[PDB]
Design a binder for this molecule. Structure first.
Ligand code: SF4
Ligand code: SF4
Ligand code: SF4
Ligand code: SF4
Ligand code: FES
Ligand SMILES: [Zn+2]
Lengths: 71, 84, 107, 117, 123, 38, 688, 208, 114
């Protein structure tokens, strides 16, 4: 129905997607209990948060951090 | 038909409707013992002018409006629409 | 800034480390401050006049009535007295002396 | 510290730095922000609609000073002036693209100014 | 002086257009958003009018609308001047009732019984 | 990483004009009738 | 008399001798901070946030658990109390991670509305922050046990009202945890109702999880209709879409609690919905068309029909305004023959002052009872908050409960007295004991369920139970007025339906072959085309297409319950009107206006146009429906208990088995419960 | 107590407690409430019978000059049983002192205007007519300032909603720029911001 | 009523005032129709004048009618002079607006009961 508003307008659309780009990361490992995540660098990026990694070797990308974190 | 149903209204206080509150003690157990087909209705509280309704003949209302009767005046007023 | 941080936001290097910084950051932008009731008034030297603000406070993050007095209410109602007895070419030369700016007469 | 065009940033290799914490919406004086969020199937929440009414946008810039994860950035490029009213309403797939026509322009100005604020 | 005492129920009109007879107001108590337990947002009567249609604006999906009032809440003091404002401008309304809870009887110490049933465990 | 080749433009219709649109979901999901036989 | 004047900040007030400092200071309009305390729970004290400096003492006490002696000076604001409320709420704000960009209670957490007003300014810790791990319990409770400030509030709820003994405390000192040691799932009735009680955002809703923040909603109060006890809810819109509900905390029913089914039944409300009128097309074809096609299609068929060839059924969830426009249409044509879906036996009374047809005891008068005996039902899996009031009134005093037939898993100490219908006949005599105690109680309570009354012996047990019921009423009766015999229901639009003057139980349509039927039943498949005559049309009018929309001629779109200013009846006769929050989608319209719009295209036209004019008609039949939220004192069944003795139909011989299973019958119940993918998501997690 | 707290003073709090006291003493005909603000301001609540002479008393004296009429405003207050609130603000030139005059009224009851008493109220007094309908008495020229010619609303009261009813548009149907009922592209999403728990101890209400 | 009036006292200084300016409008309707250079018939203007006065005839209280007198007189200040540049006078006539249905069957096909 809506398909008439762009005829001769070429539909400028995004190319890359961050729907799944976490999955191509080399999922980190430590072998400890609780780790800081000031990822992206200090005083920028997502705030400090502490995660328990005991259970199916992972963390869960911290929500904030996004990068797959595990052991 | 006549008729379809009748609707008893009363009030729990404002004691003009005590004839109806007596009428259930007098003729409700025996009034519905006879004619076990007519679905007469009783609702809760008009709180002023506790009317008595009748409805029949392609949906036409018939409202006898008792204000404050005695124990036999409620007994005799009911048979007017009942027999007809 | 003011240090007690119920009014000033905390610094950016602080709102990423401690716990006390975010709750007095994240709440300070959803709603505003906590202003006590009671009327107030002041005025300062605007470079063309006084500047009356009669800021009625109610007691929440959102203020009540905020009536402003700007110059030009007095400075242009008195054009009636100032103008007469004179030319028409005088009148445009009158106006640029009081320095009247519109949008500021919206008080 | 000059203001201008809106853009969105992201982490190293693309992550959508936005976390959709809605704070830029509640301080926009013109309510030019409108965000509908949803749990994406991976689990972390992201955005579905993201709007900046570039007509209504009064450029108070408080969105730049309200995001905790520092997502939206007033990018310093005055390149503008299209020909319709129907175009300047920016959807999301302008803004990530517009945030990725450049980043080294943006990433050096924050890194020279973040110590003051 | 020219006092000329007289009596009339003050119904004022001409200031809106037609929405006197169309709508019906509502006076009620906002009562405890129950995600938390702060009771400061009691003690003030409020109002809200009729809600009418909200469609889709077919370019973005915005909540564009008719129904020009749709957002008017005032802060009343009590039930007494609650009615007196709805009649002074004179459109229809309907009134709720304030709900205050039980006082109530709560006492620690009776949670450890010899023969009663009021007995807690696993604390 | 995720940056373009050279540049772009803010032109009116190149033919392209970015033509901004709606990016949501149908909400009510209207009912489907049963098929042709009774 | 029986009071002590205590000068709360130097100001007198008279409390009972034995109340709390908290209730004293809350009486004079103040808030002391509340963490380890709840009014609807028990009392512990292990948060230590309420700390007031009492006068003429060097020490500081906590206002949760101590009585009040002879009149003190409870010095609320001091130069030492603020050295305590700052003090405690600096520790627990350290061992906690930096959430709230993403914590889903981010607009209402009590570490966020206390921490601006009370407490300190900065931090000095400055490294630490232990981090425990989480787990999963059920597919409803999104679970981050990191945050978990150990206020022992969810823990006691397992020993409280929800009697499932499941949780505990695992650990010592700094390291203790709250969750279940083994991986046992926790799900029963009320099991989703913990995520309101958790005072921080450590617990939250699973389907709601990542949607929107709570400063954008528009709180409009309403009522839910998925059970006969009603509810007290509040909806929240976003852009004309429903987000979530919460309990509105009414003091009679829905105290701080709500039905666990109705909490997550809103998902199918916006899932499988018919939006538009769909034409007959002569085969099983069924395609949409103009709204002014199928109006004149059935309009001429109405005038062709006359007499008992046209009928209707209604047993779902519709209001009490479309059940009069239907009634003032089919009885202005003077052809009634109309019934409901639910099977209620009528022998002597029920429609005529109704005498027992509502739940006669109030819910507030349940706590004053002493010995309760109920038969033929599962109280846990129909009317869930009803057992919650029994559970609480079993506690805190003495309460005696026995039961007859089919031992199911109730929480507290019940006992299976026996299982035969002859038990009900023999209790009029002296046998199968307790034998006198129902007469020798002071506030007895005898409750009948509608699931066993659905059977063919319903008129038999209607007089058998009321035999011994009036036997206790003719005994003393209690002291006292104290109506004893009462009954329950499980369809919302039934008591509202019957007291309009309908007949209960499918018998009039069960005897004739009528031509045209109106479906407001509708998914309850007690009427098919098998019991019908040949292919004459039957018209569906409703909102969903589960059962009865494929077996139909012409369907009609309509608004469900969250779209119309409706009016319902609880199990006691109150009227709790719902209100419009979201306007209905598609081409559907409000379900009373369509009947008047169908009336004007037919011959007869009803004499009322606006919804007020509907309520003027609603005044005429019954005046208690405009009486909002009041249950008047009117029983009058000395006569009506005698009138059912005219009928002497005998019992049957069958063990009194309810339809309710272990758990699984609770989920797939009405119409939306079948359409909700959330209930389908969890019911496969129970059978696994 | 500390730095970053406003240092109050008692000298101006003394004389403004002193000066305004014998004002009610020498006109106990019109004055009904006097109060001293905790930051050196004064209110003299006056029933509007004495709208002219009390100003006329402050128009001239030898102990109170007060000839600088700065601010005429208007504040509505619903739920008061007399809605509106006319509030003056005048300045002593020789003494550097601020004082306000709070005079209530109602809608239909007029007010004797300050036209001979002050000639700075020429455009201020008309504004309350255009915005509220408070008909002042005996003004030589009552007209329409700061509103458009076709309004019937007096918008600055509370029942007038945020937008009007009069969203304007053009058509080439003949020449005209015609009015129409109002239609928005967006709701003006109204939030909910009042947090509970009563941050203020001093202004605590009578608990009833 | 403990409140002083504006101009009238009781209904008889009032009802002679609403008759009074009616003549001032009545000689004005032919006067402005050639002035503002608009083209309708002049009798339509005289119908719309009495349209406005007759509609508000449901008042049984003074000083409200007198409040409309001040409203009615202020209309003539722009009217006798030229302060409404060819639009505000045309604003009286709901001309290019689509007609309201005002009929029950007509409302029912279009609208969610507006
Ligand atoms: S800038 Fe902040 S508030 Fe705005 S979308 Fe990004 S994370 Fe959310
Ligand atoms: S740029 Fe300005 S107008 Fe736009 S969201 Fe930020 S503060 Fe608001
Ligand atoms: S769920 Fe969390 S907040 Fe609630 S009682 Fe348990 S530990 Fe305390
Ligand atoms: S629940 Fe409380 S402590 Fe946790 S993120 Fe929300 S406001 Fe902060
Ligand atoms: S508030 Fe619960 S113990 Fe202090
Ligand atoms: Zn990280």
């Amino acid at each position: 129905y809506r398909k008439v508003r762009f005829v001769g307008r070429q539909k400028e659309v995004n190319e890359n997607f961050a729907i799944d780009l976490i999955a191509e990361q080399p999922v980190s490992q430590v072998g400890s209990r609780v780790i800081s995540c000031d990822g992206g660098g200090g005083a920028l990026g997502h705030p400090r948060v502490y995660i328990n990694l005991d259970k199916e070797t992972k963390t869960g990308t911290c929500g904030y951090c996004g990068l797959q974190f595990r052991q | 038909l006549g008729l379809r149903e009748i609707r008893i209204h009363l009030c729990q206080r404002s004691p003009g409707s005590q004839g109806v509150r007596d009428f259930i003690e007098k003729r409700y157990v025996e009034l519905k013992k006879a004619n076990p087909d007519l679905p007469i209705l009783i609702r809760e509280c008009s709180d002023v002018q506790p009317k008595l309704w009748a409805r029949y003949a392609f949906g036409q209302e018939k409202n006898v409006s008792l204000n404050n009767f005695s124990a036999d005046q409620v007994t005799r007023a009911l048979e007017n629409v009942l027999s007809s | 800034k003011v240090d007690d941080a119920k009014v000033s936001p905390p610094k950016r290097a602080e709102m990423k480390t401690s716990m006390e910084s975010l709750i007095h950051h994240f709440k300070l932008y959803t709603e505003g401050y906590q202003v006590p009731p009671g009327a107030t008034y002041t005025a300062i030297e605007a470079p063309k006049g006084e500047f009356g603000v009669y800021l009625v406070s109610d007691g929440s993050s959102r203020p009540y009535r905020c009536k402003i007095k700007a110059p030009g209410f007095a400075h242009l109602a008195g054009l009636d007295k100032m103008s007469k007895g004179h030319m028409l070419a005088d009148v445009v030369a009158i106006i640029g002396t009081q320095d009247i700016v519109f949008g500021e007469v919206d008080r | 510290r000059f203001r201008g065009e809106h853009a969105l940033r992201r982490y190293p290799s693309g992550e959508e730095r936005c976390i959709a914490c809605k704070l830029c919406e509640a301080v926009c004086p013109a309510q030019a922000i409108t965000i509908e969020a949803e749990p994406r199937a991976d689990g972390s929440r992201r955005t579905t609609r993201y709007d900046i009414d570039m007509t209504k946008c009064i450029y108070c810039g408080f969105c730049q000073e309200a995001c905790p994860v520092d997502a939206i950035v007033e990018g310093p490029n005055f390149e503008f002036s299209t020909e319709t009213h129907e175009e300047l309403l920016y959807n999301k797939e302008k803004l990530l693209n517009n945030g990725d026509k450049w980043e080294a322009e943006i990433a050096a100005n924050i890194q020279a100014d973040y110590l003051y604020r | 002086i020219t006092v000329d005492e007289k009596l009339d129920i003050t119904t004022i009109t001409g200031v809106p257009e037609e929405h006197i007879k169309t709508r019906k107001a509502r006076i009620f108590v906002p009562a405890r958003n129950n995600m938390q337990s702060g009771v400061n947002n009691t003690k003030k009567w409020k109002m809200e009018f009729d809600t009418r249609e909200r469609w889709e604006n077919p370019l973005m999906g915005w909540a564009s609308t008719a129904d020009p009032l749709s957002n008017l809440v005032l802060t009343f003091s009590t039930k007494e001047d609650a009615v007196a404002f709805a009649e002074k401008n004179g459109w229809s309304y309907d009134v709720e009732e304030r709900k205050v809870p039980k006082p109530k009887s709560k006492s620690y110490g009776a949670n450890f019984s010899w023969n009663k049933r009021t007995r807690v465990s696993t604390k | 990483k995720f940056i373009w080749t050279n540049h772009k433009f803010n032109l009116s219709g190149t033919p392209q004009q970015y033509v901004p649109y709606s990016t949501t979901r149908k909400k009510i999901q209207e009912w489907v009738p049963p098929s042709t036989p009774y | 008399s029986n009071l002590i004047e205590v000068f709360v900040d130097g100001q007198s007030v008279m409390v009972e001798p034995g109340t709390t400092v908290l209730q004293a200071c809350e009486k004079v309009g103040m808030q002391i901070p509340r963490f380890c305390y709840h009014e609807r729970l028990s009392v512990a004290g292990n948060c230590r946030m309420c700390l007031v400096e009492i006068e003429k003492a060097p020490k500081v006490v906590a206002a949760c658990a101590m009585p009040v002696m002879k009149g003190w000076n409870i010095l609320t604001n001091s130069e030492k109390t603020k050295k305590a409320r700052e003090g405690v709420m600096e520790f627990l704000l350290a061992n906690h991670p930096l959430d709230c960009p993403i914590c889903d209670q981010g607009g209402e957490c009590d570490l966020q509305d206390q921490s601006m007003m009370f407490g300190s300014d900065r931090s000095r810790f400055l490294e630490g922050k232990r981090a425990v791990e989480d787990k999963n319990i059920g597919p409803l409770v999104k679970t981050i046990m990191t945050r978990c400030i150990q206020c022992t509030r969810c823990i006691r709820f397992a020993s409280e009202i929800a009697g499932v003994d499941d949780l505990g405390t695992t650990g010592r000192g700094n390291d203790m945890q709250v969750g279940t040691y083994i991986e046992k799932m926790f799900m029963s009735e009320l099991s989703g109702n913990i995520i309101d009680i958790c005072p921080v955002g450590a617990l939250t809703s699973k389907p709601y999880a990542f949607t929107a923040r709570p400063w954008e909603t528009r709180k409009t109060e309403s009522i839910d209709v998925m059970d006969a006890v009603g509810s007290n809810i509040v909806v929240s819109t976003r852009t004309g879409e429903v987000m979530r509900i919460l309990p509105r905390m009414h003091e009679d029913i829905n105290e701080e609690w709500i039905s666990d089914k109705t909490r997550f039944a809103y998902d199918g409300l916006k899932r499988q919905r018919l939006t538009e009128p769909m034409v007959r097309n002569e085969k099983g074809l069924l395609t949409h068309t103009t709204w002014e096609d199928a109006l004149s299609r059935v309009a001429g068929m109405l005038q062709s029909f006359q007499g008992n060839d046209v009928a209707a059924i209604a047993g779902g969830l519709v209001d009490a305004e479309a059940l009069i426009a239907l009634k003032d249409l089919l009885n202005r044509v003077d052809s009634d023959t109309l019934c409901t879906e639910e099977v209620f036996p009528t022998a002597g009374a029920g429609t005529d002052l109704r005498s027992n047809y509502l739940l006669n005891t109030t819910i507030a008068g349940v706590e004053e009872a002493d010995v309760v005996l109920l038969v033929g039902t599962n109280p846990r899996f129909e009317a869930p908050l009803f057992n919650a009031r029994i559970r609480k009134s079993w506690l805190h005093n003495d309460l005696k409960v026995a039961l007859i037939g089919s031992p199911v898993d109730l929480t507290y100490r019940y006992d299976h007295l026996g299982d035969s219908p002859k038990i009900l006949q023999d209790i009029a005599s002296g046998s199968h004991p307790f034998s006198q105690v129902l007469q020798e109680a002071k506030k007895p309570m005898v409750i009948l369920g509608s699931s066993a009354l659905q059977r063919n012996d319903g008129a038999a047990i209607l007089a058998a139970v009321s035999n011994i019921a009036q036997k206790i009423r003719t005994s003393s009766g209690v002291t006292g007025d104290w109506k004893v015999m009462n009954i329950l229901h499980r369809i919302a639009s039934q008591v509202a339906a019957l007291d309009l003057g309908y007949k209960p139980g499918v018998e009039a349509i069960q005897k004739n072959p009528p031509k045209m039927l109106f479906l407001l039943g509708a998914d309850g498949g007690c009427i098919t085309r098998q019991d019908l005559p040949k292919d004459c049309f039957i018209v569906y009018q409703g909102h969903h297409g589960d059962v009865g929309a494929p077996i139909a001629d012409v369907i009609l779109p309509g608004a469900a319950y969250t779209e119309k200013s409706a009016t319902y009846v609880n199990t006691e006769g109150r009227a709790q009107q719902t209100k419009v929050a979201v306007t209905p989608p598609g081409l559907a319209r409000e379900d009373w206006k369509i009947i008047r719009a169908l009336s004007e295209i037919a011959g007869m036209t009803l004499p009322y146009d606006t919804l007020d004019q509907v309520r003027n008609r609603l005044e005429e039949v019954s005046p208690n429906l405009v009486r909002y939220d009041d249950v008047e004192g009117a029983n009058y069944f000395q006569q009506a208990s005698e009138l059912s003795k005219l009928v002497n139909q005998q019992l049957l011989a069958d063990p009194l088995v309810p339809p309710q299973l272990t758990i699984k019958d609770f989920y797939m119940t009405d119409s939306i419960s079948r359409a909700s993918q959330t209930m389908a998501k969890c019911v496969k997690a129970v059978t696994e | 107590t500390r730095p970053t707290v406003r240092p109050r003073n008692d000298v101006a709090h003394k004389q403004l407690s002193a000066f305004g006291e014998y004002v009610a003493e020498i006109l106990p005909k019109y004055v009904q409430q006097v109060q001293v603000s905790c930051f050196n301001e004064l209110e003299i609540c006056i029933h509007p019978d004495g709208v002219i002479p009390v100003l006329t008393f402050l128009r001239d004296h030898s102990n109170a000059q007060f000839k600088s009429l700065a601010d005429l405003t208007a504040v509505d207050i619903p739920t008061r049983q007399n809605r509106f609130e006319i509030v003056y603000n005048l300045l002593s030139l020789r003494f550097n002192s601020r004082i306000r005059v709070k005079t209530y009224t109602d809608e239909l009851t007029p007010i004797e205007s300050s036209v001979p008493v002050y000639k700075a109220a020429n455009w201020y007094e008309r504004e309350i007519w255009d915005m509220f309908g408070v008909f002042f008495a005996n003004h030589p020229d009552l007209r329409r300032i700061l509103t458009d010619y076709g309004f019937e609303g007096h918008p600055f009261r509370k029942d007038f909603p945020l937008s009007g009813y009069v969203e304007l548009r053009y058509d080439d149907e003949v020449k005209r720029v015609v009015a129409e009922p109002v239609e928005l592209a967006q709701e003006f999403r109204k939030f909910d911001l009042n947090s509970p728990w009563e941050a203020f101890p001093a202004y605590r209400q009578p608990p009833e | 009523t403990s409140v002083k009036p504006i101009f009238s006292r009781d209904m008889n200084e009032a009802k002679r005032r609403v008759r009074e300016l009616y003549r001032a409008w009545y000689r004005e309707v032919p006067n402005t129709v050639h002035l503002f250079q608009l083209d309708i018939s002049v009798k339509q203007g005289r119908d719309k004048v009495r349209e406005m006065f007759k509609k508000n005839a449901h008042i049984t209280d003074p000083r409200v009618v007198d409040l409309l007198v001040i409203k009615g007189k202020m209309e003539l200040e722009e009217t006798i002079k030229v302060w409404k540049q060819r639009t505000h006078v045309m604003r009286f006539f709901h001309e290019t607006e689509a007609p309201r249905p005002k009929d029950f069957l007509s409302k029912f096909y279009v609208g969610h009961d507006p």
